[PDB]
Amino acid sequence: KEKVERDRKKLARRRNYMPLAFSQHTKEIKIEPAQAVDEVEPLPEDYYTRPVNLTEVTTLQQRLLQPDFQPICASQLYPRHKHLLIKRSLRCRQCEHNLSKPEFNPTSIKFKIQLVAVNY
C-alpha cells in the first residue's frame, strides 16, 4: 500500500500537473495483536532451598549455539546440525580476477589459478 502511495505521489511530482483530477481517485488482511498477560509466571519456589548442580544447568556458550529456543536445562538442549565452512576466492579493486579454487575443494590442495607474492 505504501509502495503504491509512494509511486502515485512520485509520478504526480514527475508529471507536475498540480494533482489535476482527469479520472476518479481511490480484500484486507487483519492480524490480531498479541494479548497482554495481567501477571507473568513467578519464579518457582523450588529455586529457594534446593542445591544447584552446575552439570544440570547449561553455560552461556552452549545456550547461545541453539538461539531459536535457548534452554536453561540440559535435557531440553538438543544437538544442532554441523556448520558448513567456506572456500574463499580473492578479487582486487583495479584488477578483475586474481586467484580462485576448484569445484572439488573437498580432499584437494590444488589451486585453479595459483597466484602469491612468494611465487613472483
Partner: protein, 379 residues
C-alpha cells in the same frame, strides 16, 4: 532480489542471520582474537580513534559474512539494528566500513525499540531495553518514537558483572588444590569477565519483591538485629580447572538488587518506566501502560519479569507516581522469540519487506555522492 542480511552489533553479543526467519542464524561474543593479544579486544568501543575502530569493525564484519554467514557482501542489502542515541562517530564508522570496504548495496539504520514493537504486531507500546552497558526505555506510539520522553540508567550487564566481582572478593572462599581446603581469600587479584558472566547466568537469580525488600534493609542493617531471609545453598564453581570457588548463597540474590535498589535518587530499572510514562503526553498514557515490552538479555535472568511488574505496582502507590499513574493497568507483552533475540527478529520481519526496504534504506550511490548518513540530529 535476495533475502537481506540483519546484523545487530552489541557490547556483549552480536545477533546475525537472514530476513524472513524465525530467529537469528548465529549469535556470538562481539570480540576478535588478534595475534599477540592474550585476551580478545572488544569490537564495539565508544570514544576511541576512528582508524583503530575501523580496523576492528572491518575484522569483525569479515568473520560474520564468511565464517558465521556464508554469502557475498556486495550481492544483497543490509539491515543494521542499532539502539537510539548510539554514538555519532561509531554509527558513521560502521556505515563507512560497509559502504567503502565491503561495498554493500544499501544499509538501513533501524532503532532497536521500534523493531521490537513490530514482532508483537501492536502499533503502539512502551519498550524497555535492559542491555549490557545501559538499560534504556523509549515510548513508541503508533510507529513514532517519542525522543522527548527518553530514559536511561547504567543498570545493565556491565554494572551487574562489576557488582558480582566486588561481592565475590569480599566473601572469597576458593579451594586452589594446594592445602587450600581451608577458606583462601583473593588468590587472584581480578576475575575474568567470561567467568563472572557464566556465574551470573547459572548461579544467581532475581528474588521476589517481598524477599528482595527485606534483603535491601538487611545488608543496610538500619537499627535491626539479623533481619534477613534464609538464603539458598552455597554453589561450588570451578575456576581454571583445579581452583574451586565456593559461591555464598547471599551473593546470588543480593548481586541483582543493585538494579532494583532505590539509592535515595529513586532511580531503579523499575522506576525508569514510570519516570518516562509520567513525562509522556496525557492522551498516550493508558495505551502505553497497557502495552509494555521487555527486551534485552539482562531481563532473561530468572524471575526478572515478575519482580519488575511487581516493583512497578509498588512504586505506583508511592506518593510521587500516585497522582498521575495511580489507577493504571500495567500488562506485559510476551514476544514470539526469546528476550535476547526480539530486536533482531524485527529487522528480519522488516528485511522481508523488499519494496519498503529499498526506499527507506540509504543506497551506496547516495553515500559516495554526499558522504552524509541521515540521523535524528539536525541536517
Amino acid at each position: 532480489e535476495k533475502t537481506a542480511v540483519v546484523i545487530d552489533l552489541g557490547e556483549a553479543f552480536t545477533k546475525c542471520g537472514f530476513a524472513g526467519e524465525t530467529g537469528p542464524r548465529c549469535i556470538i561474543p562481539s570480540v576478535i582474537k588478534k595475534a599477540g593479544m592474550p585476551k580478545p579486544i572488544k569490537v564495539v568501543q565508544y570514544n576511541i580513534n576512528t582508524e583503530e575502530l575501523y580496523s576492528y569493525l572491518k575484522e569483525f564484519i569479515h568473520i560474520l559474512y564468511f565464517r558465521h554467514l556464508l554469502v557475498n557482501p556486495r550481492d544483497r542489502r543490509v539491515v543494521v539494528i542499532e539502539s537510539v542515541l548510539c554514538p555519532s562517530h561509531f554509527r558513521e564508522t560502521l556505515t563507512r566500513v560497509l559502504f567503502k570496504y565491503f561495498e554493500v548495496p544499501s544499509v538501513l539504520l533501524a532503532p532497536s525499540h521500534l523493531m521490537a514493537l513490530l514482532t508483537l504486531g501492536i502499533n503502539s507500546a512502551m519498550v524497555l531495553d535492559c542491555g549490557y552497558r545501559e538499560s534504556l526505555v523509549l515510548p513508541i506510539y503508533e510507529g513514532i518514537p517519542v525522543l522527548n520522553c527518553w530514559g536511561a540508567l547504567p543498570l545493565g550487564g556491565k554494572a551487574l558483572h562489576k557488582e558480582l566481582e566486588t561481592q565475590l572478593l569480599e566473601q572469597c572462599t576458593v579451594d586452589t588444590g594446594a592445602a587450600k581446603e581451608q577458606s583462601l581469600p583473593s588468590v587472584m587479584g581480578s576475575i575474568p569477565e567470561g567467568v563472572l558472566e557464566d556465574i551470573k547466568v547459572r548461579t544467581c537469580f532475581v528474588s521476589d519483591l517481598t524477599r528482595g525488600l527485606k534483603i535491601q534493609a538487611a545488608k543496610f542493617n538500619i537499627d535491626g538485629n539479623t533481619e534477613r531471609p534464609s538464603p539458598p545453598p552455597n554453589v561450588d564453581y570451578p575456576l581454571d580447572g583445579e581452583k574451586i570457588l565456593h559461591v555464598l548463597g547471599s551473593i546470588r540474590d543480593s548481586v541483582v538488587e543493585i538494579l532494583f535498589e532505590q539509592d535515595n535518587e529513586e532511580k531503579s530499572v523499575a522506576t525508569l518506566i514510570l519516570d518516562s510514562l509520567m513525562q509522556c503526553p496525557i492522551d498516550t498514557r493508558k495505551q502505553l501502560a497497557e502495552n509494555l515490552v521487555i527486551i534485552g538479555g539482562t531481563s532473561m535472568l530468572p524471575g526478572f519479569l515478575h519482580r519488575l511488574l511487581a516493583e512497578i505496582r509498588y512504586l505506583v502507590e508511592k506518593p510521587k507516581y500516585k497522582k498521575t499513574l495511580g489507577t493504571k493497568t500495567f500488562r506485559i507483552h510476551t514476544p514470539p522469540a526469546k528476550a535476547n533475540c526480539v530486536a533482531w527478529l524485527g529487522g528480519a520481519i522488516f528485511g522481508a519487506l523488499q519494496d519498503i526496504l529499498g526506499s527507506r534504506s540509504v543506497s551506496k550511490e547516495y553515500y559516495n555522492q554526499t558522504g552524509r548518513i541521515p540521523d535524528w540530529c539536525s541536517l
